[PDB]
Amino acid sequence: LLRRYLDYPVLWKILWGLVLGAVFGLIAGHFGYAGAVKTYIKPFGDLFVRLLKMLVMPIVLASLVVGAASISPARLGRVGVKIVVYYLATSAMAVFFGLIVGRLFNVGANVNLGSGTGKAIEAQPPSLVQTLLNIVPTNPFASLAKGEVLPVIFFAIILGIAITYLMNRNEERVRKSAETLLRVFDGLAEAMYLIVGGVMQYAPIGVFALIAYVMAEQGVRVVGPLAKVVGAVYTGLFLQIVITYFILLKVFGIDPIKFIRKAKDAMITAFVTRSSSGTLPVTMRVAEEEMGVDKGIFSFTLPLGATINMDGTALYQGVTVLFVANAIGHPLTLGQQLVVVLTAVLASIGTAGVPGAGAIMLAMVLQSVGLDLTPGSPVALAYAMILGIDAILDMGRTMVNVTGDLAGTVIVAKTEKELDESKWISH
Amino acid sequence: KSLLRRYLDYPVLWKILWGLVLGAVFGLIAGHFGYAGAVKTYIKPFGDLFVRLLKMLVMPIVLASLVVGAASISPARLGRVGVKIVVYYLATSAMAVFFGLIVGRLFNVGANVNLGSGTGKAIEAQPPSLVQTLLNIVPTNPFASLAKGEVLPVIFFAIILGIAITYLMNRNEERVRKSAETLLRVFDGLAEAMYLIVGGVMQYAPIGVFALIAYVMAEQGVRVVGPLAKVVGAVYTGLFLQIVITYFILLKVFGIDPIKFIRKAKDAMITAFVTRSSSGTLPVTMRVAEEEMGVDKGIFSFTLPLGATINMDGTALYQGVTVLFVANAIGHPLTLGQQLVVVLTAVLASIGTAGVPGAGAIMLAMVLQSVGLDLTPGSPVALAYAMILGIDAILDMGRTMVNVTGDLAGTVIVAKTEKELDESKWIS
Amino acid sequence: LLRRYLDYPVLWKILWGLVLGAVFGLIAGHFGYAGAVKTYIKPFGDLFVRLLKMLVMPIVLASLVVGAASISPARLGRVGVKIVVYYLATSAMAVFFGLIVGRLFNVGANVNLGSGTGKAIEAQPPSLVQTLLNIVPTNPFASLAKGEVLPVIFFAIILGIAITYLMNRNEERVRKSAETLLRVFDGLAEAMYLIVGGVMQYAPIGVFALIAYVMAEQGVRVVGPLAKVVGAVYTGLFLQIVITYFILLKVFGIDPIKFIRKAKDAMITAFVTRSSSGTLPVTMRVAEEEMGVDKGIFSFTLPLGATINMDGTALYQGVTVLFVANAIGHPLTLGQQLVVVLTAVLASIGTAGVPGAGAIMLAMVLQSVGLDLTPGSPVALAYAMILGIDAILDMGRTMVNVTGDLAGTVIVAKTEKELDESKWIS
Numbered sequence A: 001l002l003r004r005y006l007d008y009p010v011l012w013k014i015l016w017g018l019v020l021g022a023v024f025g026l027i028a029g030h031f032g033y034a035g036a037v038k039t040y041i042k043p044f045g046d047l048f049v050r051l052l053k054m055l056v057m058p059i060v061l062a063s064l065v066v067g068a069a070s071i072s073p074a075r076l077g078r079v080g081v082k083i084v085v086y087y088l089a090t091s092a093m094a095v096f097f098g099l100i101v102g103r104l105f106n107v108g109a110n111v112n113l114g115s116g117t118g119k120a121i122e123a124q125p126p127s128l129v130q131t132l133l134n135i136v137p138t139n140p141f142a143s144l145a146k147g148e149v150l151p152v153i154f155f156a157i158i159l160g161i162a163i164t165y166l167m168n169r170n171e172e173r174v175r176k177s178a179e180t181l182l183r184v185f186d187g188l189a190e191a192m193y194l195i196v197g198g199v200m201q202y203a204p205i206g207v208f209a210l211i212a213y214v215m216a217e218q219g220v221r222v223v224g225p226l227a228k229v230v231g232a233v234y235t236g237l238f239l240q241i242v243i244t245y246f247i248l249l250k251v252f253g254i255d256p257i258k259f260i261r262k263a264k265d266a267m268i269t270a271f272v273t274r275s276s277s278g279t280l281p282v283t284m285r286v287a288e289e290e291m292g293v294d295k296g297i298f299s300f301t302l303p304l305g306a307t308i309n310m311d312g313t314a315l316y317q318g319v320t321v322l323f324v325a326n327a328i329g330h331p332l333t334l335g336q337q338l339v340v341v342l343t344a345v346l347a348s349i350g351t352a353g354v355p356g357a358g359a360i361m362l363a364m365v366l367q368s369v370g371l372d373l374t375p376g377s378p379v380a381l382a383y384a385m386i387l388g389i390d391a392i393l394d395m396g397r398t399m400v401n402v403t404g405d406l407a408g409t410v411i412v413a414k415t416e417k418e419l420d421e422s423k424w425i426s427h
Numbered sequence B: 001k002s003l004l005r006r007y008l009d010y011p012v013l014w015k016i017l018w019g020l021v022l023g024a025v026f027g028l029i030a031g032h033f034g035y036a037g038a039v040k041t042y043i044k045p046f047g048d049l050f051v052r053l054l055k056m057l058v059m060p061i062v063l064a065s066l067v068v069g070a071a072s073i074s075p076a077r078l079g080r081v082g083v084k085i086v087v088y089y090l091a092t093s094a095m096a097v098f099f100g101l102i103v104g105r106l107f108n109v110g111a112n113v114n115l116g117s118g119t120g121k122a123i124e125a126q127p128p129s130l131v132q133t134l135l136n137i138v139p140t141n142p143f144a145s146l147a148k149g150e151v152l153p154v155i156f157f158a159i160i161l162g163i164a165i166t167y168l169m170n171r172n173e174e175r176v177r178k179s180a181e182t183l184l185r186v187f188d189g190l191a192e193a194m195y196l197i198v199g200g201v202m203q204y205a206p207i208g209v210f211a212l213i214a215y216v217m218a219e220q221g222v223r224v225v226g227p228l229a230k231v232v233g234a235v236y237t238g239l240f241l242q243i244v245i246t247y248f249i250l251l252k253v254f255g256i257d258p259i260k261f262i263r264k265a266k267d268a269m270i271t272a273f274v275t276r277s278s279s280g281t282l283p284v285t286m287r288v289a290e291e292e293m294g295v296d297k298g299i300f301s302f303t304l305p306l307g308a309t310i311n312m313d314g315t316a317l318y319q320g321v322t323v324l325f326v327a328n329a330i331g332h333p334l335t336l337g338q339q340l341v342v343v344l345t346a347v348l349a350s351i352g353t354a355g356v357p358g359a360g361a362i363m364l365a366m367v368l369q370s371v372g373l374d375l376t377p378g379s380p381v382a383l384a385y386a387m388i389l390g391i392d393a394i395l396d397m398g399r400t401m402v403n404v405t406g407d408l409a410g411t412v413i414v415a416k417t418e419k420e421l422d423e424s425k426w427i428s
Numbered sequence C: 001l002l003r004r005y006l007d008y009p010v011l012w013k014i015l016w017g018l019v020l021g022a023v024f025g026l027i028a029g030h031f032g033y034a035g036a037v038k039t040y041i042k043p044f045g046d047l048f049v050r051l052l053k054m055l056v057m058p059i060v061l062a063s064l065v066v067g068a069a070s071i072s073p074a075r076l077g078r079v080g081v082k083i084v085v086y087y088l089a090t091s092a093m094a095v096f097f098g099l100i101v102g103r104l105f106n107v108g109a110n111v112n113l114g115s116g117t118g119k120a121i122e123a124q125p126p127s128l129v130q131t132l133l134n135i136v137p138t139n140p141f142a143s144l145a146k147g148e149v150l151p152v153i154f155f156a157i158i159l160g161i162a163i164t165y166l167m168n169r170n171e172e173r174v175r176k177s178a179e180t181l182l183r184v185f186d187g188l189a190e191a192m193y194l195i196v197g198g199v200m201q202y203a204p205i206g207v208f209a210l211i212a213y214v215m216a217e218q219g220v221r222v223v224g225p226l227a228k229v230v231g232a233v234y235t236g237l238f239l240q241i242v243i244t245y246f247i248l249l250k251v252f253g254i255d256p257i258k259f260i261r262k263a264k265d266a267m268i269t270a271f272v273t274r275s276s277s278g279t280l281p282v283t284m285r286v287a288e289e290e291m292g293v294d295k296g297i298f299s300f301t302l303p304l305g306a307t308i309n310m311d312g313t314a315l316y317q318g319v320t321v322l323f324v325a326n327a328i329g330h331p332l333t334l335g336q337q338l339v340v341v342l343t344a345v346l347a348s349i350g351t352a353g354v355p356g357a358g359a360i361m362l363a364m365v366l367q368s369v370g371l372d373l374t375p376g377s378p379v380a381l382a383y384a385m386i387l388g389i390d391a392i393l394d395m396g397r398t399m400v401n402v403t404g405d406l407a408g409t410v411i412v413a414k415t416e417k418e419l420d421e422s423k424w425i426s
C-alpha cells in the first residue's frame, strides 16, 4: 500500500490529508477514542513536525547568507522597510477584523460574575531596548544551538554582506576564499531545500495525523459559547485573507487566486504544526519553487515575518478579550478593547511563531489589566474555557500568518523586480 | 637521546599492548601495597588526558565521515547495510544471552548467604517508551545535537545530508553541482584531518592505556576475591566464548580470517577496554576499520557509530551473570527460563543507549527495582548490588571491549558481502 | 547629524569619545543624573559590546586554524614558550609595581578594626591538573557554543596543523579537500576582520556611552581613601606601560611611541569594555593592520594572552590587599603581602578577561586567609568600599593587559621575523 499512496497525484494529496484527518478526528473523539488517536495516529504527525524542525536552522542560516550576498545592502535595507510597512498595514486591518467579528458574533453570552478587584499592578513597564539589543547574538554558535531565529538572521545578513565585499576585493586569494565560503552555504541551503521536498512526500500522512489528534481532543469542545469564539476567529481569518491579502496582492498586480494555490502547502503545514518557524522550510521552498521569489528577498522577509507578524495575534486577542469581558459581565467599550489588543500586539512583537502563543499572551493581558485569576474565580473560568479550545484557535492563528508572510514576500519581491513572472504563467 | 625520543622510537605494533600488560601489573602491585591513592593522583591524569583527546574527535569524525560515507554509496545499498548490520546484532546478542546464562550457572555465582524478602515478578509497572525513543532519532536542531554530543541524531542528520549531496552533484545546473561538491569537500577535508589526528593520539595511547588500566587495577583489583572473583571469571569467560566462538565462527562463515582480524582490531579492543566507552573509542575503531581492516567509509561510517549505540552483546553477558549472582546471594529461586526473561527485558530496555561507563550497574539497579526487590540500605539485595557495584569497572572493561570487537566483526562481514572490503589488506 | 559624525576624521575619534564621555559622565553623576545616563546613553555602549562579542568565537577559531596552518609546528611551540616567558617576566614586574605604589600611596588610612592572621584555612592547595586537562575539549562543537576560548585555541591549532599535513599529501583528492577546508576558514576569518572594521565606525559612540555610564555611577565615589586606591592603581598601570612595556619593546628594537599610537584602539576598547576576550576582534585587527604581525603569531598569542595575562591582577591585588590590611589595622609585612599576591595570581591563571574579575578574586583572598567577611565586619566594610569603585579599577586593569598582550605579541613576532617593517618606517 506504500506504492498505492505515492502514485496517487500529489497536487491535492496534502489537502485530502487535512479534510480526511479532521473528519476522522471528530468521529474518533465523538465516540470516545481520542486516546487511541494519541497513541496510534499522532506519532506519525510528531514525526512530520520533527523532520521540519530539523531543517529550520540550516535552511535559515544558509539561505540568508547566500541571499544577503546576492543583493546589495541598500536594497536589503529597502526590503526591510517595505516588509515592515507591509506588516504594520496588515496588522492594522487584523485589529479591525478582530474587533468587528468578535462583536458580530457577540462572543460570551454565558454568565459568571466579577469585575475585579485588583490585584493592582503597574507593571514592568514594557521596555523594548533589551529586546532590540538581544537581536545581536553575543555568540552566533550559541544562537544556532539554541535555535534563536532572530540573532541568526542578524549574523547571516552581516556575514552575507561581508562576503560580497570580499569577493569584490583586489587580492585573488581573498576573493577565492570568500567565494568558497559562499559556495558552502549555497551547497547547504540547496541540500536543505532538497530535503524539504522529500519531507513533503510524507506530509499528507503527517498532516492527517496532526489534524486528527487536534480534532479528536478539542473538536468535541467546540459547542455553545466556544463555538461562537471559533466561528468569530475563523471568520476573522477568512476576512484577513480574502480582503486584506487579496486587495493588496491585486493592488500590486498579483493574481490572488494564483497565490492561494501556490501557498497551500505552506498554509496547511502552518495550520497543523501551529508554528511559523517550524513551517519555514516549507514556506521558503514554496516561495522558491511556486512563487518564484528570489532568495534575495524571501531568505530575509520570511524568517523575519515568522517572528514579527502581528496579524494572528490581533485576531486572537480581539476575539478572546471580548469573550472574557462578556463572560464576566465587565463592560468594555470599543475603544478600551482597541487599547487592550494594541498593547498585547505591541507586547508580542519579538516572539516567533510557537504553539500555545495567544493563550499565554491572553493570560498576561488579563493579569496586567488587574483581573483576578485565582482558581475558581470567574476570569480563571473564562480563561480556562478559551485555554481548552486553544489548539483549534492556534491552527488558524498560525495559518493566517504564514499566508500573510507569503503575500508580503511576494509583494515586496514584485516591487523589487525579484519575482519571476514565468512561474505565474499557467497552461 | 632523551626519554621522549626513545619512547616514540620503539616500534608501535605491540607498544599499546605493553602499556596494557605493564599497566595492569603495575596497578595490582600498587593496590596490594596501599598506594592506589598515589596512582589516582600521579598516574591517572595521564589516562584521563587520553580519554579527552579521543572524545574531542567523536562528533567531528562521526559527522564528517558519515556525510562523506553516505554520499559515496547509493541510498538503496545504505538501506541494505542498515538491515544487514541490524540482523547481525540480533544474531550475536542471542549468542551473548546464551553464553551469559551458561557461564553464569557454570561458575554458579553466589553461595555467599544473605536472605531476601519478596518478588515479583515484573509488577509494579513497565511502561513502553519505544515510540518516543524512535521519534528522538530525528534531531529537531542538528546544531544542538552536535553541541550536546548526541550520536544517534547526528547519524541521522549526516546520512540525510550525504544522500542529498550526491543528488545535487548529479543535477544539471553547474552551480548547484559546484556548490554541493564544495560542501562535500569540506566534510571530506574535515574527516581526513580527524583520522590524521587519531593517528597522532595513538602515539600517546600506550601511556594513556597504561595510566587507565593501572588505576582500575589498583582500585578494584584488591576487590576481586572470594565470590566476586567468580563473577569476574564468569563474565570474562562469557567474553572469550562470545569472541572465539560467536565472532570467530561468523567471520569464518563469510570468509574472513579470524586470527588476522584480532591482530588488526587490537588497538580498538584495548582502547575500548580501558576507556570503557564505545562512543569514545569510535575514532580508534573507525581508523582500525580504515587502515587495518580495509573497509570502505560507505560501510563503517554507518555501521560503527550505529553499533556503538545498538550492540546488545556486552549487556546480555553482564546482566546474565550478575542477575544470577544477586539471586543466589539472597537465596531467591530463579529458573533458567525466569533468568532468560529478565536478561531479555534488560537487553530490550538498553537498546539505543550508547556505550558509557557505569552502564550495567545502572541497568542492573533498574532490573532489581522493576522486579520488586527491596533495595533499601542494609537489605540483602542492596548488599549484593553494592558488591557488584564495587567491581563494576573491571566488568565494564570487558563489556566495552567485547562490543567494539563485535562492532568491527559485523562491519567487516557486512563490508565483504557488499564487496566493500579491500582484500589486499588481508593477503598473507 | 548622521552624516557629520562619519565625515569627522577617524584618526583620533575614538579617543575623543573616551575623554568627552568621561567628562560627560562625571558631570552627569555630580548633578544626580546617572540614572538618565543608564537609560538613554548606556544601550549605545552595550550595543558596541554585543557587536564585538558576536565576533570573538568565529574570528578566534578561523584566524587560528588559518594561522596554525601557515606556520610549522616547531615555530608555534617556540612562539608558545616565548610568549609564556614574556608573561612571566611582565607579571613579575607587575607584582613589583603593585607592592611599590600601594605602599607609596599608603592606601587605607581610614580606621576600622579586626585581625585574621591565618593562611590556607579555606583550605585548597589548589589543584591545577584538571585545569590543564580542561584545555582539551571533549566536544569542540560544545566548546564553541559555550564560548570557551582556551579549548577552541587547542582545537584550532591541531586542525590547522593537520590541514597542512593533508595539503602535502600525494593524493590530489586529499590535497584539494584540505585546501577547500582551509579556504572556508580563510574566508570566514576575512569576513570577521571586515566586520570589525565596520563596528569600529561605531566605536566612538560606543566608547562614549560606556565611559559615560561608568563615570556617572562610580566617579562620584572616588574621593577620600578610595581616591588614593584609584590613584595607586592607575600609577601602577602607567609604570607597567611606560617602564615594563617600553623597555622590553626597546630592548628588542621596537619604537615604543609608534607602538602606543598603533595600540590605542585596542587599549581604549579594553578600557571601556573591561574584557580582554570581548576586545579580541579589535586587538587582533590592530595586530594585523597596524602592527603588521603575521597571523601565524597573533592568532595564537593574543587569545592565549586574554586568558593567561597576570599583569592587571598583580596590580589590582597588590593595592587592594594593602588597602584592606591598613583599613582594618592588620599589620602586613612586605614579604607577607608578596605571598598573598602570588597565591592570588596563581589562583587566577586560566580565567579569561571578564568584568568583575578582581572584586571576586579579592573576596576569595580575604576569605582564604581567614578574615571575617560576615556583614558589618571591618573586612566586609573595606571590601565593600573597593567593590563600589571596582568598575573604575576594572577599566584600568583590562587596558594594561591588552597593551601588554600587543607588546608581547609584537616582540615574539619580531624575534620570529614575522613583523612587517614597512608599517613602522614612516
Ligand SMILES: CCCCCCCCO[C@@H]1O[C@H](CO)[C@@H](O)[C@H](O)[C@H]1O
Residues within 6 Å of the ligand: B075, B076, B077, B078, B079, B082, B159
Ligand atoms: C538507513 C538508511 C536508509 C536509506 C534507505 C533508502 C531507501 C532504500 O530503498 C531503495 O530506495 C530507492 C530510492 O529511489 C528506490 O528506488 C528503491 O525502490 C528502494 O529499494
Ligand SMILES: CCCCCCCCO[C@@H]1O[C@H](CO)[C@@H](O)[C@H](O)[C@H]1O
Residues within 6 Å of the ligand: C078, C082, C083, C085, C086, C089, C248, C411, C412, C415, C416
Ligand atoms: C622577555 C621575553 C621575550 C621573548 C623571548 C625572546 C626569545 C629570543 O630567543 C630566540 O630563541 C630561538 C631559538 O630557537 C631563535 O629562533 C630566535 O631567533 C631567538 O631570538
